[PDB]
């Protein structure tokens, strides 16, 4: 458990008004409606968030995979094995605060709401 990632988890759970986890599980999970979002440090000093979508095809996918003004705009790919849709974003922990971590989470959730 690296210190930056633990501080990021604490600040996010404070922004979400949730108790900060006490067991140093590397990958955490938050249920935002039907969206099972996963937080991890991958790579080191990088907060990665990703959720899984239902279905395989998507006619609004490659446009979602175009860069935007928001670096937290989630990328839409598929599971390596299997073919489940996947939404994921990532930020450098060394440049974040609480608000930007919360923004990363809410961007992932908003994209999961829009797609497909």
């Amino acid at each position: 458990m690296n210190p930056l990632y633990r501080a990021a988890i604490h600040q996010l759970f404070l922004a979400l008004d949730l108790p900060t986890p006490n067991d140093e599980e590397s990958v955490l999970s938050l249920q935002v409606g039907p969206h099972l979002c996963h937080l991890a440090e991958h790579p080191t000093d990088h907060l990665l968030m990703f959720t899984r979508l239902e279905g395989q095809g998507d006619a609004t996918a490659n446009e979602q995979n175009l860069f935007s003004q928001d670096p937290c705009k989630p990328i839409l790919g598929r599971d390596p094995e299997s073919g489940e849709r996947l939404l994921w974003n990532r930020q450098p922990l060394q440049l974040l605060d609480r608000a930007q971590i919360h923004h990363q989470l809410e961007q992932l959730v908003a994209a999961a709401e829009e797609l497909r």
Partner: protein
């Protein structure tokens, strides 16, 4: 503080913990040196399309 994103901490599936650490072999080692690099002055059409793309998207 409170509100905005309503959520709750839940357990992490082991498949999700495996996905959260997936790795790929490093690629393109020494590729820039082999292919070389030079400054390009592309079509004015390309430059205008780039301006539209970086201004709108």
């Amino acid at each position: 503080r409170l509100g905005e994103v309503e959520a709750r901490q839940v357990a992490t599936p082991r498949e999700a913990q495996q996905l959260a650490q997936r790795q790929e072999a490093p690629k393109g080692e020494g590729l820039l040196s082999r292919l070389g690099a030079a400054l390009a002055r592309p079509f004015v059409a390309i430059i205008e399309w780039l301006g539209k793309l970086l201004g709108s998207r």
